[PDB]
Ligand binder design. Structure first.
Ligand SMILES: OC[C@H]1O[C@@](CO)(O[C@H]2O[C@H](CO)[C@@H](O)[C@H](O)[C@H]2O)[C@@H](O)[C@@H]1O
Ligand SMILES: OC[C@H]1O[C@@](CO)(O[C@H]2O[C@H](CO)[C@@H](O)[C@H](O)[C@H]2O)[C@@H](O)[C@@H]1O
Ligand SMILES: [Ca+2]
Ligand SMILES: [Ca+2]
Ligand SMILES: [Mg+2]
Ligand SMILES: [Mg+2]
Ligand SMILES: [Mg+2]
Ligand SMILES: [Mg+2]
Lengths: 569, 565
C-alpha cells in the first residue's frame, strides 16, 4: 500500500508568491494598486494553489524607490491604504489558510524618516544611527572637498552625500534618499528587533530581508582612521560615477553582516518559542557568489541564519542562451553547495529583473513553472509568471525607476530600468487589463494583455494558469513533498527531473529547452516504467493531459515540456 | 560484465621525453632512456603512454616547433630507437601514442621555406597577409590585425623574403598552417598514416582550439580585429588584451577533427588489431570542449577531449563542495556514451602537489583512479613530484622568455613542471649520470624519488600501484558513482555495483580536522576495511573502520572496501 508520510512544516515546501502591490490590483481608480485590491483577490492565491504571499514594501514611503525608501517602518503607505486595511488583509488571508510575509528593509531609511531627521541634527540617541564621515583631508588643494572614499552607489554617483546642516557626508549605497544605518550601533540593531516584533505582533508570518550584502562596510578603525577606497575594476567602459568602476571589497559581503542575520534568527527562534502557532520565518535577499550566499543559512561553527537565502540562479546564470546541460548544472549548484538539512528554493523572477518568458522564450513558460514546482523545496512565483506575463514596453517618458533615471538616458535607460517587470497585472481583457477601471495607470499596461490575461486562461481549455494549478495541486502528493529527486541531461536539448518514492506514483519532467526538436530514449529515465500518462503538457504540446506514452522513443518540439505520471517504484 | 575496449578505462601516462631518462649523459632525456624504463609502466599499472613531441625540431618550444614531421629528433635518438621503443612497449602490453602538432610547423620546416619562397603548391600552406598603412608614422607598417600570440606580441611576423606577414598563434618560429587549404589537410592524413603504419596506437592532438581563424573573404578582404578585453592590466602586446573571437574555437575547426576520426575509423577497419585512438588537447569552455567528442547532428570526433578541470578550476583554494561541483561538470556535460577522463597535470602547468598541497597527493591520485573512465597521469604525479626551482638564468621556456622578465618570468614559466624525473638519490636523481641537466633537478630529490618510495612500507607510489590494481575490479570498470560533500572540508565518492564490493573515497581537502557521520554515505555499511590511506593517515591498509563518526586530519584520504550493495 502507499506509505503514510508526516506533513512538512509549512515553510519547507510552500509555494511562495511575490506580490508587487503597486501593480497587482487597483480598487479605487487612481492607477495605483492597493491593499483593498489585494484583499479583493486573496481568493486568487487559493485558486492558484499558493501557500504564502510576500508583499514588496507597503510602509510609509516618499516612493523615490517605490517603497524601499521607508519614512515610517510602523505604518502603511497612504496610496496602498491604512493599518486597518492591513489588519483586514492579514485576517482575511489567515482565514483562507494563507501565510503573509512583509518586505523588511533593514539596510537603509528614507531621508524623510524621523531616524534621519534626528541623526542629521545630532539628536542624542540618533547622531550615530547612520554612517557619517568627514571629507578626506586634501592638503594638496585645501579649498577642494573630497568624499571619504571612491565608493559608488548601486544607483550611480558617489555613495557619499554632503549634508550642509551636519557638515558631514552620509553613506547611501542606494539613492541619495536611502541612508545606510550603522549596523555597528547596538541602538540600530535593537530598532530592527523592535520593527520585526511590531509586525509579528500584528500577525505577520515572517519577512523577506532586503539587500543584506550591503549591511556593513569597512570600519575606518581598520584603515588608519579613513574609509578605504574600494579597489578599481580596471574596466575601460566605467568612469568613477558609474557602477562597475569599483570592486565592492569594503562595501559588500562583509563577514560581520552574517552575525546580524544569525542575531535576527536567534530573536525569531525566541519569538516562535514564546508565541507558538505556526513558525514565523525569514527569507534573505542577496545577490552574491555561492559561498557568500550559503553563509545566510548558517556556518560550519553551528550558526543558524535565514530559513533560506533566495536562489537567484534562474535569473543570474540561465537564460534563452542556456542548453539542457546548463539547466542541470545550475540546478546542481544549489543542491551541491547548500548545507546539510538546508531547504532548497527556486526563484524565476522578481520586481528587479526581466520577466521569466522575456529572459527565456514565450514557448518555455510551462517547462519553467514545472521546474519550479517539481524541484525539491520551495517554489517562488513572481506576480504574472502563473499566466506567462512578458516585460511591458516602457518609454523613457513613462520610466519612473530611480535606477534608470539615475544611471540612464533616452539611449541607455532600458539597460537599467526594472519598470518593464512592474507593469500592471493582466486580470482580463477589460480597460487596463482589469488592473484598474481607469486608462491612467502608474506604469503602462503591456500591449499584449488581450492575448495574455488570467480570465482568458481560466476560460480556454489549455493555459499557463491551468498548468500552474495542476502543478501546485501535484505538490500535495507525497512524491513531491517527500520523494527523491534525480536530474540529468538526455542531450544538449532535453533534460529529465524525476520525483520518486517507494509505493507512490513517479512523476517525470521532460523539457526540451532548445530551439530544435529532440528525440530521446525514455529507457534512460530512471524509475520511468511505460506505459505512462501525461499529467501536464505545455500549452502547444501534441500531447493532452491523459495522453498515454507507450513508445520508448519520444520526440519533443522546441520548448515542449511534459509531466508524466508512472506506476510506483 | 562485457570487457571494455582498452582506451575506455586505460591509465594513460604522459611522458615528457626530455626530462624522463637520459641514457647517454648529455643531461637530455632520450628514447633509449624511455626503453630502459618501460618496465616502470608495468610496475605502476599504466596501460598506455603518450610522449610529448619527439620529431625533428629546432627545440624553440622543445618539440612543438617541428621541422620534419616524419623523423626523430637527433638529441632523443633515431627512427631505429623509436621502432625498438614501440616493439618493447607492445611486448610489455603497453599502448603508445604520439604528440601530433597539426596547428603549426617550425619556420625551419621545408613546408615553410617552400611557402615563403612561393614554390608552387605551397604558396597557401600558411596564413600570408598584407600590411596595413600606419596612422601616426607612414613608414612603420601595421599588421593585418590586432591579434595577440599566446606567447606575447603580435600573432603576425613580417617575412623580408615574401614581403607579407605570416600568422603565428604560438612562437614567431611556429607558423600556422592554412586549414582551408585541402593540400594542408591531405598532409595531415599523410603524417598520421606514416606513424600509424610504424605501429603507433594513436595520437594526442595539440592546440586544436587554434586550428582556424576568420576568413578575410567574410570581412571584405581584411582580417577582423579581435574584440578588446578592456582590462587595464593588459597592454596591446600582452595575452589578455583581446578576446579571441576570430582566432580560437571557430566551429569549422571541429569539422577537421571529425574528418580525422573518419580517416582513423577507416584505418582501424582496414588494419584490425587494437583500436588506434585520438585524444584532443584544447583549453576552452565546457560547451566548446564537448564538441570535440562529436555533435548532436551525429558527427564523431576524438575518442575524448582531455578534461583539464583539476588544472583550471580546482586548487589549494578549493573546498569539498568545489571539488564535487567541478567533478560534476564533465559528468553533466559529456554526451551519452562518452568516456570521462581526468587530468591532474601536464608539461604546461604547475605540478599537482604545488597547485594543491603536498598532504593532498594521495587523495588526488585516488580521485583520478576511482572516478569513472580514464585516469591521466603526468610524469612525476605517481611519486608526488613538486615544481622544481628554476632561476631566470636557467629558464629556457620561450613562453617565460617572451612574456616575462627576471621579476615576472615565474608567472609564465612551464619549466618548474619539466625538471628531470626523480628515479633515485644518485647524481641528478638518477635521470642522468651527468650533473649538467637541460633543466636543474628539483632540490628535494633526496626526499622525493621512486627508489625511496619502492622501499618504504607506505608511499605515494605504493598507493598509486594499489589504485591502478583496484581499477581491474568490476566496481571501478562498470560500477555506478555517487559523489557529495559532507561538509566544506570533506567529500565522498562511492563506486557500487550489485554483488561486487563497494569502494568509498573519503577526502578531507581542507587544512583542518573534520569529523563526519559515515551514516550519511550511501551504500557504505560498517565494518569496512581501509584499502588505501594517505601516507600521513593514522589508518593503515587492513585497518577496520567500525564507528560511524570519522575524524579525518588535514588532507587525509581513505579508500574503504565495504560489502556489496
Ligand atoms: O537593482 C536593484 C539592486 O538592489 C537590490 C539589492 O539586493 O534589490 C533590492 O534592494 C533595493 C534597495 O532597497 C531595491 O531597489 C530593490 O527593489 C530590492 O529588491 C538588487 O536587486 C540590485 O542589486
Ligand atoms: O601555455 C601553452 C599554451 O599552448 C597550449 C595550447 O593547447 O599547449 C600546447 O600547445 C603549445 C604550442 O604547440 C605548446 O607550447 C604546449 O607545450 C602544448 O601542450 C596550452 O597549454 C596553452 O594555451
Ligand atoms: Ca549598509
Ligand atoms: Ca591556426
Ligand atoms: Mg489604487
Ligand atoms: Mg538591474
Ligand atoms: Mg640523453
Ligand atoms: Mg600557463
Amino acid at each position: 500500500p502507499p506509505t503514510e508520510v508526516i506533513q512538512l512544516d509549512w515553510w519547507k515546501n510552500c509555494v511562495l508568491y511575490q506580490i508587487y502591490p503597486r501593480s497587482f490590483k487597483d480598487s479605487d481608480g487612481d492607477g495605483i494598486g492597493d491593499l483593498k485590491g489585494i484583499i479583493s483577490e486573496l481568493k486568487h492565491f487559493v485558486d492558484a494553489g499558493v501557500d504564502a504571499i510576500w508583499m514588496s514594501p507597503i510602509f510609509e514611503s516618499p516612493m523615490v524607490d517605490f517603497g524601499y525608501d521607508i519614512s515610517n517602518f510602523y505604518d502603511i503607505h497612504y496610496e496602498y491604504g491604512t493599518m486597518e486595511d492591513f489588519e483586514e488583509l492579514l485576517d482575511k488571508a489567515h482565514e483562507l489558510g494563507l501565510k503573509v510575509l512583509l518586505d523588511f528593509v533593514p539596510n537603509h531609511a528614507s531621508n524623510e524618516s524621523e531616524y534621519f531627521i534626528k541623526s542629521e541634527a545630532r539628536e542624542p540617541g540618533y547622531e550615530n544611527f547612520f554612517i557619517w564621515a568627514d571629507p578626506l583631508p586634501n592638503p594638496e588643494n585645501p579649498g577642494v572637498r573630497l568624499p571619504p572614499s571612491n565608493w559608488v552607489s548601486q544607483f550611480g554617483g558617489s555613495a557619499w552625500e554632503w549634508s550642509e546642516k551636519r557638515q558631514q557626508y552620509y553613506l547611501h549605497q542606494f539613492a541619495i534618499q536611502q541612508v545606510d544605518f550603522d549596523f555597528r550601533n547596538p541602538a540600530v540593531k535593537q530598532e530592527m528587533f523592535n520593527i520585526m516584533k511590531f509586525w509579528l505582533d500584528k500577525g505577520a508570518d515572517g519577512f523577506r530581508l532586503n539587500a543584506l550584502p550591503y549591511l556593513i562596510e569597512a570600519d575606518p578603525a581598520d584603515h588608519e582612521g579613513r574609509y578605504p577606497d574600494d579597489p578599481l575594476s580596471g574596466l575601460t567602459q566605467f568612469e568613477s560615477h558609474q557602477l562597475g568602476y569599483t570592486i565592492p571589497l569594503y562595501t559588500k559581503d562583509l563577514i560581520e553582516l552574517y552575525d546580524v542575520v544569525y542575531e535576527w534568527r536567534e530573536f525569531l527562534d525566541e519569538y516562535n518559542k514564546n508565541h507558538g502557532g505556526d513558525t514565523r520565518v525569514v527569507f534573505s535577499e542577496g545577490y552574491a557568489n555561492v559561498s557568500m550566499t550559503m553563509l545566510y543559512y548558517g556556518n560550519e561553527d553551528g550558526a543558524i541564519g535565514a530559513h533560506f537565502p533566495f536562489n537567484f540562479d534562474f535569473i543570474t546564470d540561465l537564460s534563452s542562451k542556456s542548453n539542457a546541460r546548463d539547466f542541470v548544472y545550475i540546478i546542481l549548484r544549489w543542491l551541491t553547495y547548500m548545507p546539510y538539512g538546508g531547504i532548497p528554493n527556486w526563484v524565476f523572477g522578481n520586481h528587479d529583473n526581466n520577466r521569466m518568458p522575456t529572459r527565456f522564450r514565450h514557448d518555455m513558460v510551462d517547462g519553467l513553472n514545472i521546474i519550479n514546482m517539481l524541484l525539491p523545496g520551495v517554489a517562488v512565483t513572481y506576480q504574472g509568471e502563473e499566466i506567462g506575463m512578458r516585460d511591458g514596453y516602457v518609454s523613457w517618458e513613462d520610466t519612473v525607476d530611480i535606477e534608470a533615471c539615475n544611471r540612464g538616458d533616452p539611449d541607455t535607460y532600458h539597460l537599467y530600468s526594472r519598470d518593464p517587470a512592474r507593469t500592471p497585472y493582466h486580470w482580463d481583457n477589460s480597460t487596463s487589463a482589469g488592473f484598474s477601471t481607469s486608462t491612467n495607470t502608474w506604469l503602462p499596461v503591456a500591449e499584449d494583455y488581450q492575448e495574455i490575461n488570467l480570465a482568458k486562461q481560466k476560460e480556454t481549455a489549455r493555459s499557463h494558469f491551468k498548468n500552474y494549478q495542476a502543478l501546485t495541486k501535484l505538490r500535495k502528493q507525497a512524491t513531491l513533498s517527500h520523494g527523491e529527486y534525480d536530474i540529468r541531461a538526455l542531450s544538449d536539448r532535453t533534460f529529465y527531473l524525476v520525483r520518486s518514492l517507494p509505493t507512490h506514483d513517479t512523476y517525470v519532467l521532460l523539457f526540451n529547452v532548445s530551439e530544435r526538436r529532440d528525440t530521446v530514449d525514455l529507457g534512460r529515465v530512471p524509475h520511468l516504467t511505460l506505459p505512462a500518462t501525461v499529467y501536464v503538457s505545455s500549452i502547444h504540446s501534441a500531447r493532452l493531459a491523459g495522453h498515454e506514452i507507450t513508445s520508448s522513443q519520444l520526440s519533443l518540439e522546441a520548448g515542449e515540456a511534459l509531466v508524466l505520471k508512472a506506476q510506483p517504484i
